[PDB]
Design a protein around this ligand. Structure first.
Ligand code: ATP
Ligand code: ADP
Ligand code: ADP
Ligand code: ADP
Ligand code: MG
Lengths: 281, 1544, 97
């Protein structure tokens, strides 16, 4: 049972759902509970004096803000959701989120398109850490954009490939996908001409007929002369294995940024870690 | 006025109760009620029919009462039909968008279709009215607002479908079907028009005229899409000859025909059709050129797929499904909703991107959320896309009152109708409401998704969703769009779950050049590209180079208004040239006239009619330089509106205003009036921006009168102060329980105009918002100021702004208004230089020479005085030079020209009244012209001095007097050093010193330091005269100065000279609202319905009510710098009344005036008063009495005091000197910088004298040493009790000793000033000093008795306990003696207070605060305390703690009780009646025979003051003390503060 | 980062009992070593799940310090960690460089 917190009817429905679930054993999710900090204390007191069913689970979705009561935080288990630490983690999360049966469909080229989409999303989202250089402002490039891009890819691949097992890479609607990503999916959030130019550059570099060649370069000159290679696989599991075997030595040059784009950030983070460890001495 | 409303209500109520048959079962009781009421109504109608004479009907007994009762009963019945209204809305989905009153009218008038013709504009997109035959039994067709009409293929007959719902649904379905058939025929014709080398203009214009504006553009789009599809299919072979060039040629030749057609004169409907066709074909040409350039040969290429394409299938059986609209992978069906003639928007690439993103969102079954700055066309883009698909788009201007239930009801309406919802400013909702609404949006989207699944079949169960705990069917055509400005920080943030339900899009930079080019091309402007490429950069330069002002807007809206004005100006110029050629010669050629047509000066003329009025003086030459640079060699000359100028002249003469032409006096004001007229002509939303007293109100009033006299159209103005009332009272509120909508002020006014019961649509109606603008209330007018011209309420009701209504704002600044509202209103900038001082002088002199002061010898005196002061009221005169100099000085408040000018004018009116009084007192010898001249000149100098420097210190008053003496030629006093400010003007016409009015009096012994007693001083005699002068004309006035300066004392002494004037005390705090003033009005005044309107006047006939606001500048300023009560007072001063929120009725004040008091605005917690408020209120600075004045005042008090003991009469001078010196050093040493409560004033010295007098009263004899001991004891109790730190107390002790030895040298130290200075009347009858040991023994015995009889907790008697119990005993022995004990918890404050109350016989009362405690419980406790202490004559020690304060209302009520001794609004209704009864028995018991309620309440207040004692105990917090100093000023100026603190 | 005593007790219960690594191990000393290892592992896994990724390194550093204090065959390394934490508080001079 999903309930959005903020209205009196919402509070009554949440109380009724909790009272029903602690007996039946169902699940209850309450969204944006940080908007009612006063009611969270009463909810915690109600939860403490309670012996619910073994299968009952209560989920409280909230944003990280100090208005959430401390007693509620101590009573429950906290799970922080945030951008993945790196490109490898972002791609792994994207592949795990998308069902296996969705990627494995009638055209074998769908897996490569999904891998290109995952890499593009990882590159775009990881550049947001270097806010002034990777972009011009902290855009909300998130899971909704990835889902819309997946839907667009599925729709246009199904339109072009009418159930055929294989489709020529030149026959893939590259222009349709590129334009939709640049205008509606990811370019909708962009309100800067140069951010749009960068997005168009990324889309025209990644989504092209040359992406299906063995020589294709995901990134060029990550350090010295080494560069990231496009996988030669044609199936989802091979792409996932390639993602898992990433060097785990990521630098901002994976994103196209200079290697020195992270020096100030890393120095500040190290100083902040020193301060945090000293604060709990 | 009552008959028509009752008849109108009864018509539709009887219609509903008769036509409907299910209403008898659902709601029978009020059905029977209405049957009886209708029987009475029919009896009345029969009686009227017997004698149709008006006077015979008027002579019917109790006819007015009968009609009022009928109206009340009809209203009660009408409000009792909500469930039936919901039932009726359920059957026909479009009833969800119509109001409750309008639904009542619609259902009641089902039989009489005639009154439904103004209600179809609410349920349909473009259907304003329906077309019926003469029988009114068959619906032949429908009509639009512009007059365009559609005839049904098969007309719907009402007789065959008598039910309102049935025939309404048939009309809607037949409208859709006939639109489909007409579209099919139009496509068939345009196919013949298409694929043609040349187009005959005659047949093309015939086809355009034949079909609707909505259908011609659709047919053109269908034909172009089919042509492009066929051409691309032909090119599909690859490397083939391109027939796409033929399609481009066809588009170009058709556009050439359209341009030729728009060059000449066309009917307005055909002109709009041609404009829409041109706008669409420019986009078609651009798309075709883009297709050709890219070398596109496949019809499946995305560069063609991404475009919007229209496909028509003549083989489709369903005419509604014949047309399919596709763009990218999204496919839509035309809704075929009659849109009328809407304004098409140029299809800019941004609009294209918007179309693509929003259609992609629609296909994926989730809403679209365009965002960006205002003026980017986000809302318009959404409306244009909705109209392109033939959808019904409803626009809602969301605000914080759009709660979960209202938004859910709107969603239910949209789901059932199948309409589009464009929720503008969707982030103005509260975040909790956003989260709650996300649930409903998700359910609706899930229902749409399950509808879109191919497994679902329409023959199966209908798709329904859970909306407001009901099953609501969801039409597939429904869409949800939310447009918001994320940049606005105040706007609430959207939750992530709600944001994921919408597809966002950034609309930040509209393509202004394209829109300008296409708009000018469609209007017939040759060389439109050059004009656009000149005018868009010109707007950029205006934005950049011109100075930054808060009212400047050079965005798309400004250019859009400029372009439409250019089109209108070109049309008017064409008409003028045609009429000139008609009156001279007979040859007319439209082509030649258009060829030699100066379009550049037309564009510049529009720019000047729009940009120039808002320009500041320094920017007009700059903008004209920009015009010269961008458009060289062409000039614009403003039209000479002599017809309006003569009317302006007449109105100015009748209104005593100054008129001027060009560079004459008052010319700039007339130019501003003409600019305001132009902006009114070209806009429906206006703002008059400019500093206070720039002539804005007079400008628009004179404009309204001149327009009324010129055009013959009566003008009505509704002036509303938006910030004087809450937003709920301004716009309306929705009941969370019964879901009943109560109209606000603006909503009621607009609805009354729209309904037009008394022909309000035939009058020029101007709704003026004379008040501050903040983005809380003005953003609700966003949809009103937009083309939408619509007011959307949370209850789903939408009110269209009538074309005769103008929404005007009269503001002094726009520093808090956002660019959203600035871009939505034409601006006229009224600089202060527009209203020159010479014009004000001329207005004052004309009013004096014309308007009599009494209500003619008085008029003759006024004329003579005006003649005498005429030389001094000219430019570069005495008054003007003094005003220029006075602005260089600093004052206690910000100086404004009109405050000083109004003060001076009031003083001159007082001088004229004084001359009239002299003439009346000397009938034999009337005052001669030489005496009159001398008196008037001297009084003019005196009034200039007291008006231009009243709010400044004595030093600057002397400076202004010296400057006047330097510049004036009037004879002046020959005093070598005494300033002119120290002289008055005797009625004989000569200067006399104010010292002659200051006698050295000997106040009576029993009247020593009494509140009524006032020692006469130069400042007192000067301020009393000034206050009498200002109060005589009933002009509101403000006293400014330090606390205890004597402002209230000066005012009450001045009011004592006026016996026809009664004062009512009001004490404002930080939580003060106009509700306090309303309570005062209800208690002291009464509302009566005069024939001219409701008038509020005091109950006492012939008496003027003076409202004394004690602290006028404490009330909190909101985030946008506005005080609601200050705006309220400004409204009732400027406009002489306010608005009654109960019925939105204007109430005019009568015999009511206001007097304000306040500390200087630099003091903590004090906010500066608005310049629009200070304009009407003179400010006088009552400063602290100097050492000489203090020595004189308290010296007299001491001499009167020491007369009790003859042996001490020789010590009055040293005692007064010691008191003054110690008070001065204490004031200097302890300032408010250290602690908020460190305020020392003459009030401390008054207490000092009173305490010494009370100690000395019973003593028969007393040595000097005992007098010194009493003096030191009083000094300690007054100056050391409130001290916090121990060093401060040590300083006070040491300096008390030092002062006592300095001023009394020949006394012994130990006997008079032993450190344990303790005084008590417990051991003995008299207030003699007591030693510590015997006091301790007495307190021990009394504490044993206290344990035996009362609260039993053992206590320790140390020195501090004895001192504190003595202090509390001292306070409890005084009338209106309240306490403020500050110290840590558990220090004994409450226990000692209870012990002293038991000792002094007081009854301890404490409020029993619990969790469920609310304001009503506190009010009941206060009523109980007041009844016990004021009616039963019971001494009560009301002990209150800071923890008992759970609301600011607690503090406000306690502040009022502490200050006045009574709360005005506490006793109302039956409580007031029983209070008066109990007061009557109490007065009878006391021996007083009081008859009326006024003296009963006065006696009750006196009893409460005498008996009730309030003890406030709070912890010693730093910021809490400062907060209390502002939220409760009476806690610090009415309560004695003893700082207990922690135990030492 | 609000954690109660019951959270740590649950971690300790999940380490002592329901531990996959203790399915077929019978030696007491190596069982104790396995329990000690999984104590730190499970503590980090559970706590860092509700922690920002920037504080994961801080918590891991503190856990590593805790383990380092618990090893007999290791120097205290107190001065090194004091210089690592409060190193920047040493006052220097222009001529010192
Ligand atoms: N044409 C005129 N000639 C002379 N005096 C004029 C003229 N027009 C207005 N005045 C006077 O000058 C003053 C202008 O007051 P008005 O209320 O019009 O100004 P305002 O700028 O709208 O004021 P506020 O900002 O306080 O609302 C009044 O005293 C008015 O009578
Ligand atoms: N493509 C367009 N063609 C013509 N006028 C347009 C276009 N886009 C916007 N406008 C005009 O711009 C002004 C502001 O549009 P509006 O929808 O209120 O903007 P926003 O959504 O940014 O507040 C209106 O006069 C509107 O008609
Ligand atoms: N000429 C005077 N005669 C009598 N009392 C005076 C005189 N001048 C000042 N005072 C004293 O100054 C104080 C003014 O009190 P009040 O009128 O309440 O001041 P405010 O209006 O500034 O709060 C009183 O104690 C009053 O007795
Ligand atoms: N001088 C004292 N001797 C004995 N008990 C005292 C003394 N002063 C305070 N108390 C104790 O303080 C408590 C009462 O606190 P109270 O006076 O109501 O607090 P507050 O000072 O905050 O008003 C009782 O326990 C009482 O015995
Ligand atoms: Mg808008």
């Amino acid at each position: 049972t999903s309930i959005a917190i903020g209205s009196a009817e919402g509070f009554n429905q949440a109380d009724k759902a909790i009272n029903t679930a602690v007996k039946s054993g169902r699940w209850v999710m309450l969204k944006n509970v940080h908007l009612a900090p006063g009611w969270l204390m009463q909810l915690e007191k109600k939860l403490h004096s309670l012996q619910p069913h073994a299968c009952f689970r209560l989920f409280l979705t909230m944003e990280i803000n100090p208005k959430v009561p401390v007693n509620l935080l101590r009573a429950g288990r906290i799970f922080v959701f945030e951008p993945p630490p790196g490109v490898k983690a972002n791609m792994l999360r994207t592949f795990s989120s998308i069902p296996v049966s969705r990627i494995c469909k009638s055209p074998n080229e769908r897996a490569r398109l999904y891998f290109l989409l995952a890499w593009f999303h990882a590159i775009i989202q990881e550049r947001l850490r270097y806010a002034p250089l990777g972009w011009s402002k902290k855009y909300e490039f998130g899971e909704s954009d990835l889902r819309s891009a997946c839907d667009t890819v599925d729709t246009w691949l199904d339109d072009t490939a009418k159930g055929r097992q294989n489709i020529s890479p030149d026959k893939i609607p590259w222009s349709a996908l590129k334009t939709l990503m640049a205008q509606s999916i990811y370019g909708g959030r962009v309100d800067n001409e140069f951010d749009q130019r960068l997005l168009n550059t990324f889309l025209e570099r990644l989504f092209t007929t040359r992406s299906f060649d063995s020589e294709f370069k995901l990134a060029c000159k990550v350090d010295g002369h080494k560069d990231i290679q496009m996988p030669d696989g044609i199936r989802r599991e091979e792409f996932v294995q390639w993602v898992e075997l990433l060097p785990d030595t990521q630098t901002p040059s994976w994103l196209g940024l200079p290697n020195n784009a992270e020096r100030v950030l890393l120095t500040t983070q190290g100083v902040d870690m020193i301060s945090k460890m000293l604060k709990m001495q | 006025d009552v008959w028509i409303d009752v008849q109108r209500r009864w018509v539709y109520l009887e219609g509903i109760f008769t036509g409907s048959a299910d209403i008898k079962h659902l709601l029978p009781v009020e059905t029977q009620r209405f049957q009886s009421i209708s029987t009475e109504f029919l009896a009345l109608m029969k009686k009227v029919s017997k004698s149709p004479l008006v006077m015979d009907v008027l002579n019917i007994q109790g006819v007015q009462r009968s009609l009022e009762r009928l109206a009340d009963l009809l209203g009660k019945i009408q409000k009792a039909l909500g469930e039936y209204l919901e039932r009726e809305r359920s059957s026909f989905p479009r009833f969800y968008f119509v109001g409750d009153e309008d639904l009542l009218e619609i259902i009641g008038n089902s039989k009489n279709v005639a009154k439904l013709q103004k209600h179809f504009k609410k349920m349909f997109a473009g259907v304003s009215s329906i077309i019926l035959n003469e029988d009114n039994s068959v619906v032949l067709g429908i009509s639009s607002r512009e007059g365009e009409e559609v005839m049904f293929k098969t007309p719907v007959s009402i007789t065959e479908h008598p039910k309102i719902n049935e025939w309404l649904t048939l009309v809607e379905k037949e409208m859709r079907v006939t639109l489909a058939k007409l579209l099919a025929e139009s496509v068939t014709e345009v196919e013949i028009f298409g694929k043609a080398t040349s187009i005959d203009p005659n047949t093309y214009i015939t086809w355009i005229d034949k079909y609707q504006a909505q259908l011609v553009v659709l047919s053109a789009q269908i034909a172009w899409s089919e042509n492009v599809e066929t051409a691309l299919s032909s090119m599909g072979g690859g490397g083939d000859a391109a027939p796409l060039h033929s399609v481009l040629s066809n588009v170009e030749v058709t556009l050439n025909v359209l341009a030729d057609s728009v060059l000449m004169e066309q009917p307005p409907l055909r002109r709009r059709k041609l404009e829409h066709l041109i706008t669409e074909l420019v986009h078609q040409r651009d798309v075709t050129r883009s297709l050709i350039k890219s070398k596109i040969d496949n019809a499946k290429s995305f560069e063609w797929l991404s475009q919007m394409r229209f496909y028509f299938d003549p083989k489709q059986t369903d005419v509604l499904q014949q047309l399919s609209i596709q763009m990218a992978n999204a496919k839509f069906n035309y809704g075929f909703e009659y849109l009328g003639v809407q304004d098409k928007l140029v299809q800019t690439p941004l609009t294209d991107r918007c179309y693509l993103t929003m259609t992609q969102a629609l296909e994926a079954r989730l809403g679209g959320s365009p965002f960006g700055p205002a003026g980017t066309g986000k809302t318009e883009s959404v409306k244009a896309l909705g109209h392109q698909l033939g959808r019904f788009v409803l626009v809602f201007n969301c605000d914080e009152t759009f709660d979960f239930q209202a938004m859910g009801r709107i969603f239910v309406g949209l789901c059932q109708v199948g309409a589009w919802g464009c929720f503008d400013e969707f982030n103005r909702l509260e975040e909790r409401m956003l989260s709650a609404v996300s649930q409903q949006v998700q359910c609706i989207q899930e229902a749409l998704r399950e509808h879109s699944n191919p497994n679902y079949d329409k023959t199966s169960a209908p798709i329904t969703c859970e909306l407001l705990n009901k099953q609501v069917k969801v039409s597939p055509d429904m869409a949800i769009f939310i447009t918001m400005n994320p940049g606005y920080a105040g706007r609430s943030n959207l939750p992530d779950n709600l944001k994921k339900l919408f597809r966002s899009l950034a609309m930040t930079k509209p393509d202004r050049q394209l829109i300008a080019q296409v708009m000018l091309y469609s209007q017939g402007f040759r060389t439109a590209e050059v004009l656009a490429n000149k005018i868009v950069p010109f707007f950029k330069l205006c934005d950049e180079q011109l100075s930054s002002q808060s009212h400047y807007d050079f965005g798309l809206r400004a250019l859009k208004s400029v372009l439409v004005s250019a089109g209108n100006v070109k049309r008017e110029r064409i008409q003028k040239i045609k009429r000139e050629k008609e009156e001279r010669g007979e040859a007319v050629d439209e082509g030649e006239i258009a060829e030699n047509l100066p379009e550049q000066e037309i564009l510049i003329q529009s720019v000047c009619e729009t940009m120039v009025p808002k320009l500041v003086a320094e920017d007009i030459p700059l903008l004209f330089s920009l015009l010269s640079d961008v458009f060289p060699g062409v000039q614009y000359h403003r039209g000479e509106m002599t017809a309006l100028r003569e009317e302006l002249k007449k109105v100015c003469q009748e209104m005593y205003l100054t008129y001027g032409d060009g560079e004459e006096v008052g010319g700039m004001w007339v130019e501003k009036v003409l600019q305001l007229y132009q902006i009114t002509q070209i806009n429906h939303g206006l703002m008059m921006v400019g500093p206070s007293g720039s002539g804005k109100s007079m400008a628009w009033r004179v404009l309204l009168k001149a327009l009324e006299r010129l055009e013959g159209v009566e003008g009505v103005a509704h002036i509303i102060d938006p910030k004087a009332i809450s937003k709920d009272h301004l716009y309306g509120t929705l009941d969370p329980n019964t879901r009943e909508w109560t109209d606000g002020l603006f909503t009621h006014v607009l609805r009354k105009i729209i309904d037009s019961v008394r022909g309000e649509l035939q009058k020029r109606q101007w709704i003026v918002f004379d008040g501050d603008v903040d983005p809380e209330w003005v953003e609700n007018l966003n949809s009103v100021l937009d083309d939408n011209k619509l007011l959307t309420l949370p209850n789903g009701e939408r009110l269209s702004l009538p074309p005769n209504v103008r929404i005007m704002f009269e503001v002094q600044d726009l520093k808090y208004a956002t660019l959203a509202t600035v871009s939505r209103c034409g601006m006229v900038w009224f600089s202060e230089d527009v209203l020159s001082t010479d014009m004000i002088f001329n207005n004052f002199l004309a009013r004096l020479r014309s308007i009599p002061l009494d209500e003619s010898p008085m008029l003759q005196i006024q004329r003579d005085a005006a003649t005498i002061m005429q030389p001094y009221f000219t430019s570069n005169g005495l008054v003007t030079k003094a005003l220029e100099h006075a602005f260089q000085l600093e004052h206690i408040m910000d100086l404004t020209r009109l405050r000083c000018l109004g003060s001076l004018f009031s003083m001159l009116h007082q001088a004229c009244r004084n001359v009239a009084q002299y003439n009346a007192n000397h009938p034999d010898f009337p005052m001669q012209i030489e005496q009159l001249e001398r008196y008037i000149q001297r009084y003019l100098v005196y009034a200039i001095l007291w008006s231009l420097s009243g709010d400044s210190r004595l030093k600057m008053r002397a400076e202004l007097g010296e400057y006047i003496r330097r510049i004036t030629t009037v004879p002046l006093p020959t005093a070598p050093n005494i300033p002119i400010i120290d002289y008055e003007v005797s009625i004989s016409g000569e200067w006399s010193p104010w010292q002659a009015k200051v006698p050295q009096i000997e106040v009576e012994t029993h009247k020593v330091a009494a509140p009524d007693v006032v020692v006469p001083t130069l400042d007192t005699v000067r301020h009393e005269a000034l206050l009498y002068t200002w109060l005589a004309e009933h002009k509101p006035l403000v006293l400014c100065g330090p606390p205890g300066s004597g402002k209230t004392m000066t005012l009450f002494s001045a009011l004592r000279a006026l016996p026809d004037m009664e004062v009512v005390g009001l004490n404002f705090s930080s939580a003060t609202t106009p509700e306090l003033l309303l309570k005062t009005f209800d208690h002291y005044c009464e509302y009566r319905r005069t024939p001219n309107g409701v008038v509020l006047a005091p109950v006492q006939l012939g008496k003027w009510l003076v409202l004394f606001c004690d602290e006028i500048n404490l009330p909190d300023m909101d985030k946008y710098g506005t005080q609601r009560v200050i705006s309220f007072i400004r409204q009732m001063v400027e406009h002489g009344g306010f608005y009654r929120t109960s019925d939105q009725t204007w109430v005019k004040l009568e015999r009511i005036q206001f007097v304000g008091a306040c500390n200087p605005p630099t003091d903590p917690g004090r906010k500066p008063l608005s310049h629009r408020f200070l304009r009407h209120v003179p400010v006088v600075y009552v400063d602290y009495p100097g050492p000489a004045s203090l020595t004189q005042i308290y010296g007299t008090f001491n001499r009167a005091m020491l007369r009790l003991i003859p042996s001490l009469r020789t010590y009055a001078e040293p005692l007064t000197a010691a008191m003054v010196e110690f008070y001065t050093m204490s004031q200097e040493r302890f300032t408010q910088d250290t602690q908020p409560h460190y305020i020392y004033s003459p009030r401390e010295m008054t207490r000092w004298v009173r305490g010494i007098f009370e100690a000395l009263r019973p003593l028969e004899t007393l040595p000097v040493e005992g007098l010194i001991r009493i003096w030191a004891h009083e000094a300690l109790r007054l100056f050391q009790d409130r001290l916090v730190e121990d060093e401060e107390r040590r300083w006070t002790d040491e300096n008390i000793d030092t002062v006592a030895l300095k001023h009394f040298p020949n006394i012994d130290r130990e006997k008079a000033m032993s450190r344990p200075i303790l005084y008590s009347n417990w051991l003995s009858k008299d207030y003699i000093p007591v030693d510590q040991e015997e006091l301790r023994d007495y307190v021990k015995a009394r504490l044993k008795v206290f344990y035996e009889e009362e609260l039993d907790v053992p206590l320790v008697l140390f020195n501090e306990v004895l001192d504190h119990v003595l202090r509390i005993d001292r306070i409890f022995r005084q009338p209106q003696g309240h306490l403020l004990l500050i110290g840590v918890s558990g220090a004994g404050k409450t226990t000692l207070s209870r012990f002293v109350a038991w000792m002094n016989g007081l009854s301890v009362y404490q409020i029993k605060v619990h969790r469920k405690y609310t304001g009503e419980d506190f009010d009941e406790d206060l009523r109980t305390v007041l009844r016990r202490s004021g009616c039963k004559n019971e001494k009560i020690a009301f002990i209150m703690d800071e923890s008992n304060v759970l609301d600011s209302g607690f503090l406000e009520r306690m502040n009022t009780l502490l200050a006045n001794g009574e709360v005005p609004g506490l006793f109302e209704g039956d409580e007031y009646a029983t209070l008066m009864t109990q007061c009557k028995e109490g007065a009878q018991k006391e021996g007083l025979m009081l008859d009326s309620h006024e003296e009963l309440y006065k006696w009750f207040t006196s009893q409460v003051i005498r008996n009730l004692h309030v003890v406030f105990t709070m912890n010693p917090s730093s910021e809490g003390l400062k907060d209390r100093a502002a939220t409760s000023p009476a806690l610090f100026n009415r309560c004695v503060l003893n700082w207990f603190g922690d135990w030492s | 980062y609000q954690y109660s005593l019951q959270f740590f007790l649950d971690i300790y219960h999940n380490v002592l009992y329901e531990n996959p690594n203790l399915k077929g191990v019978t030696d007491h000393t190596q069982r104790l070593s396995i329990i000690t290892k999984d104590l730190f592992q499970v503590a980090f896994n559970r706590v860092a799940r509700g922690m920002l990724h920037q504080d994961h390194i801080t918590f891991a550093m503190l856990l590593a310090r805790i383990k380092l204090k618990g090893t007999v065959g290791e120097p205290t390394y107190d001065a090194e960690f004091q210089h690592f934490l409060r190193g920047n508080e040493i006052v220097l001079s222009a001529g010192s460089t």
